[PDB]
Amino acid sequence: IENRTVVVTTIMESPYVMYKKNHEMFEGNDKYEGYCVDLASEIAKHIGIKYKIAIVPDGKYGARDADTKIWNGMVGELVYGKAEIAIAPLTITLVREEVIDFSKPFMSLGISIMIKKPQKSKPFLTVERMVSPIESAEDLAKQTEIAYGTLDSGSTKEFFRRSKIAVYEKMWTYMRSAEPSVFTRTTAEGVARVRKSKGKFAFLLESTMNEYIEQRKPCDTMKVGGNLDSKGYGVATPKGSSLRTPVNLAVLKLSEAGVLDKLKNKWWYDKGECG
Amino acid sequence: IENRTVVVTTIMESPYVMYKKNHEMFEGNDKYEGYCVDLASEIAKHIGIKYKIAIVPDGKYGARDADTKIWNGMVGELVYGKAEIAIAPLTITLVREEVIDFSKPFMSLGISIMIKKPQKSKPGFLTVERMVSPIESAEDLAKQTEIAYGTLDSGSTKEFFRRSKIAVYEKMWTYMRSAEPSVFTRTTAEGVARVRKSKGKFAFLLESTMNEYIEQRKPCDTMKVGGNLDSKGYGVATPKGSSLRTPVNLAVLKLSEAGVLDKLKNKWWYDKGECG
Amino acid sequence: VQNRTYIVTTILEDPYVMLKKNANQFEGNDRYEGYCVELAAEIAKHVGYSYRLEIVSDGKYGARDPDTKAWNGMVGELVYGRADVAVAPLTITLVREEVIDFSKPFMSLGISIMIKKPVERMVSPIESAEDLAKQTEIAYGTLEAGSTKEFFRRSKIAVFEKMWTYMKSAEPSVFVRTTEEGMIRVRKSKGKYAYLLESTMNEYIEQRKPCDTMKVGGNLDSKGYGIATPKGSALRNPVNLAVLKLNEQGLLDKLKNKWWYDKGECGS
Amino acid sequence: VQNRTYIVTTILEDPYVMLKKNANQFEGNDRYEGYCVELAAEIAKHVGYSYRLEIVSDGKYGARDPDTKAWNGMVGELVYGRADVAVAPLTITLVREEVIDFSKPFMSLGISIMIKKPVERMVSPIESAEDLAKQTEIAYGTLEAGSTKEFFRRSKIAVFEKMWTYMKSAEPSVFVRTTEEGMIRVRKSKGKYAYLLESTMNEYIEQRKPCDTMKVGGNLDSKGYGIATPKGSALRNPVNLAVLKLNEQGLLDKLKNKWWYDKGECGS
Numbered sequence A: 001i002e003n004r005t006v007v008v009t010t011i012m013e014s015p016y017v018m019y020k021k022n023h024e025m026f027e028g029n030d031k032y033e034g035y036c037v038d039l040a041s042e043i044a045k046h047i048g049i050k051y052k053i054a055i056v057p058d059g060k061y062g063a064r065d066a067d068t069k070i071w072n073g074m075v076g077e078l079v080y081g082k083a084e085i086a087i088a089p090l091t092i093t094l095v096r097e098e099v100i101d102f103s104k105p106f107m108s109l110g111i112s113i114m115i116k117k118p119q120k121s122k123p124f125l126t127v128e129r130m131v132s133p134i135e136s137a138e139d140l141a142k143q144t145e146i147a148y149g150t151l152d153s154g155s156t157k158e159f160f161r162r163s164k165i166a167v168y169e170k171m172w173t174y175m176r177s178a179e180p181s182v183f184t185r186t187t188a189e190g191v192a193r194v195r196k197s198k199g200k201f202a203f204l205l206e207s208t209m210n211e212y213i214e215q216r217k218p219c220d221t222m223k224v225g226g227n228l229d230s231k232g233y234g235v236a237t238p239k240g241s242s243l244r245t246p247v248n249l250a251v252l253k254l255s256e257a258g259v260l261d262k263l264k265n266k267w268w269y270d271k272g273e274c275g
Numbered sequence B: 001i002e003n004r005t006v007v008v009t010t011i012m013e014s015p016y017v018m019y020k021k022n023h024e025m026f027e028g029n030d031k032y033e034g035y036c037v038d039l040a041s042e043i044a045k046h047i048g049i050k051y052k053i054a055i056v057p058d059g060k061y062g063a064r065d066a067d068t069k070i071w072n073g074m075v076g077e078l079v080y081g082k083a084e085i086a087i088a089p090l091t092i093t094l095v096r097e098e099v100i101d102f103s104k105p106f107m108s109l110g111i112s113i114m115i116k117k118p119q120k121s122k123p124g125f126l127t128v129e130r131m132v133s134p135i136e137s138a139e140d141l142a143k144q145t146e147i148a149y150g151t152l153d154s155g156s157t158k159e160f161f162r163r164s165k166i167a168v169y170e171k172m173w174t175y176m177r178s179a180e181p182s183v184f185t186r187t188t189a190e191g192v193a194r195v196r197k198s199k200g201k202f203a204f205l206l207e208s209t210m211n212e213y214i215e216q217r218k219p220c221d222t223m224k225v226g227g228n229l230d231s232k233g234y235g236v237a238t239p240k241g242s243s244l245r246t247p248v249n250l251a252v253l254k255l256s257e258a259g260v261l262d263k264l265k266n267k268w269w270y271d272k273g274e275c276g
Numbered sequence C, D: 001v002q003n004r005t006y007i008v009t010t011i012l013e014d015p016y017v018m019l020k021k022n023a024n025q026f027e028g029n030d031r032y033e034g035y036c037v038e039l040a041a042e043i044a045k046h047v048g049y050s051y052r053l054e055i056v057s058d059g060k061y062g063a064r065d066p067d068t069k070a071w072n073g074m075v076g077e078l079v080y081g082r083a084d085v086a087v088a089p090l091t092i093t094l095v096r097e098e099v100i101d102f103s104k105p106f107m108s109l110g111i112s113i114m115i116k117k118p119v120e121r122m123v124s125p126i127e128s129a130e131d132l133a134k135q136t137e138i139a140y141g142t143l144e145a146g147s148t149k150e151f152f153r154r155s156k157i158a159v160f161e162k163m164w165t166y167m168k169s170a171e172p173s174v175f176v177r178t179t180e181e182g183m184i185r186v187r188k189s190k191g192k193y194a195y196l197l198e199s200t201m202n203e204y205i206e207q208r209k210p211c212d213t214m215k216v217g218g219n220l221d222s223k224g225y226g227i228a229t230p231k232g233s234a235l236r237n238p239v240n241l242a243v244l245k246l247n248e249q250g251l252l253d254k255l256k257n258k259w260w261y262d263k264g265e266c267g268s
């Protein structure tokens, strides 16, 4: 199990995997570092196997095409034998589960509200308390002087289109009826819009990226409110593979040992630029 | 080694070695716990030798007698072969190194000024309150005479002032000798009680380590101020010519470099302190 | 898998499984009401089997006996084949997953802080583990023998380590024998005690009368309840897929709202 | 041990050994003045031997070459028998003690914090390691390759570990090539930089012009200088006893005061 080298497909997306400094003089797995790289190292230690990181050429997480019925991304690589392990942020989704087997979630996340950091507004003085105009999703939906949106596809838009709790239904109604267009092509564009709008726009993106962006310069974004829904990231393995059980037990042992929390803290706050 | 169990003599004095809770149901070394007990544990692990803690019956640290020329206490027990290692607060001193050999100091200390914690004095800005210490160092202690300063009636602390030639520590000795009534105390506990009772009008000059230990005890009415007047060390004494000198010395040095000694000092001073 | 009724095993824990106020005029599955009963009904609807609710006799979550190496409670009933499906708040852990198969978590939780609901603008309520660690006026404690105390015992984080050293060097011991006694003591402590317990229980206690406790801060760790089956059971895939469908369609988040806030005795 | 002159090894370090302003009208031991020269004179008086001061050629404290396993500097001179006594600021450590014999420390030491000497009442100057760890406005750094950086690298204390992680994840690198450049940087930083160096050098620099730096806080660790001899040398016991006598009678403290404050160019 150690002589053979497995293909560990992964996606180039910070802070999970980034180009290491002076990566040209490194070779193999040393060129990439991040949360996912170290998680792969720990998992390979637990299973006692040798691995090589192979970034997926397509650059997509994974979805099934409409007419051709061919899977793409890491899910496509796992299905068609390109790789065997997919240590990367891959949301445990029903449609992804029907073809491949997911392990237990190594990090829990959900849709979170992103707002610009509160600042001294131009119109007791010893101490200053910054009051956030939004406290949760209910306050965001009740008052409509602020605009809020999400990326033009993915899990968030479908979740708002599908929710029936009558609050996110109203949120979806406002989002669809809003003029001009509120959806953003990319998450980076949405963050730029939030920063540029001077606190007049909010972004509904997943909590992990929200916390990562909050700890980056110019430190002008913050996380507010609890998670609207619940999801998780899984270490996907192909259906019927013999590596499912060792991977699952390795993730569970790492989660109980506190190594996962150590990694998240180290790559979110310890290496953050607003610390 | 583990050839035989050695007699590790120690003195019953907190926080180095204290009676453990429910010590009757424990046996051997488990009855005693403290900084010195743990230090003995690490030293015996480093040398790989089994040991047994045996408190000296006399209860004294050790000093040469005037007439019989006999050695008492821990130094006496080491000299006459009743023990082999003394892991205790035994100060490295010239007259104690003429009969036995000391290792490197595992803890540095010196004479320190003890004063009652500043309080809300009765009046004769209000948002934050700064407690100003009336005394900051030995120079201010000697310059101002509204507060009397005392020491222990027979020890290294008094002999340091008797033998010192620096102007500050000579004026201090002169005032302390000419002070009325008697300023020297009988025991350290009695001196601490006098400091606490005098409502901050009396300062006591005792060892820095004990000052830090007492400061972290209830009712948080004592504190340390100023730097150490002199420098001394606490050593793990071994008898002269013993083969255990070098392993003990290297073990203490390794423990000091590894930071284990600082960890133990923190654990037994601040972590287990009752004051905060 | 038809013409056969399965024996579901679940514990009486609120809001999960609670006896109805009209218990003595109802029989069968109609005796019990709660989050887990509705979850079992929906899972049986999706998978397509008939089931009967049965309670574990000893009323405990599964633990491994250090002497006999035997499993008790719902996990023990699952391992020895006495029951088929355990739709209950059974936490996913390394030890249990070695013997039984857990579905994907239908409810995420973690360790949280519960405090009594209360120079003047400078005061700040506790909102994180660091604030509780750096402040000592208000004591905090956990269950005397539970996963929370063990978590602070084995934790490698500096903040949690300092917290644990505070717990182990403080008297009287704040560790309370039971959860009910813990919440009673917190209520009677008048803000001088914070109890560290599971997030779901803290949220439900927040919604219980007389509404004098609140939950602050995020989850210190990450856990998740699960629906366990015996290893090699034929219902692993249908149950997992059903749980995923309820997670995406929002049925689990609807039952949570129904049994936590909609039927809560407190306003929000 | 008479009719023989001993070659004594020492290094040019201020104020331990300094060249006199009248150096070129003096010869022999009269060329050098400082704390260590007077210490050597007193030790030679007490033990009763004739000695000649000889400065180490390469001017370094002893370190072990990883690839040749050879000792350089004063320690290297001691091991190979070129010199007899090293009355110099030579720190007692585990590695050096394994090859040479150190006397009892004649001067305690430790890691100190060096800063430029400067809601108003609420401000708090840095006075301990915890204050420097919790506050990040003022960057702090040590020598690029020294015992201080290694100490913070290997330290197991939580505060020191957090400080080390702060240093290793900060740019530009605050670590300074040499002590003089570090002191100049502290002078020119206007209170935005704190230098972590040995306590004796911090105290001596505090008594140097233009007196814009000060030492604050206690020693983070415990170290001590020593007077080393080759292993098995016949002068170990006389040197140890002489050091103890000078320590008890206050001669060591008197020389330290004379060469730190009495001859200092700064008021106190």
Ligand SMILES: NS(=O)(=O)c1cccc2c1c([N+](=O)[O-])cc1[nH]c(=O)c(=O)[nH]c12
Pocket: A061, A062, A089, A090, A091, A151, A154, A155, A187, A205, A206, A209
């Ligand atoms: N908020 S984000 O930074 O951009 C983002 C960050 C991280 C993982 C994402 C993700 C987004 N997305 O576009 O919404 C979609 C998506 N879809 C998957 O299937 C998956 O596995 N992971 C993801």
Ligand SMILES: NS(=O)(=O)c1cccc2c1c([N+](=O)[O-])cc1[nH]c(=O)c(=O)[nH]c12
Pocket: B061, B062, B089, B090, B091, B152, B155, B156, B157, B188, B206, B207, B210
């Ligand atoms: N200030 S104290 O708490 O009571 C005290 C504490 C600890 C060690 C002491 C000591 C005193 N003392 O009485 O001054 C004298 C003394 N003499 C020695 O020879 C020795 O080794 N250790 C000590």
Ligand SMILES: NS(=O)(=O)c1cccc2c1c([N+](=O)[O-])cc1[nH]c(=O)c(=O)[nH]c12
Pocket: C013, C061, C062, C089, C090, C091, C092, C143, C146, C147, C179, C197, C198, C200, C201
């Ligand atoms: N909420 S509680 O009373 O304070 C509670 C306290 C302590 C342990 C619990 C627990 C609850 N629970 O949710 O009912 C469920 C549960 N499930 C497991 O599998 C396990 O191991 N430990 C527990």
Ligand SMILES: NS(=O)(=O)c1cccc2c1c([N+](=O)[O-])cc1[nH]c(=O)c(=O)[nH]c12
Pocket: D013, D061, D062, D089, D090, D091, D092, D143, D146, D147, D179, D197, D198, D200, D201
């Ligand atoms: N002057 S310094 O910048 O603070 C200093 C920096 C770095 C290493 C030092 C050192 C000093 N010192 O105090 O003269 C003495 C010394 N002695 C040893 O034996 C050794 O190994 N390393 C050192």
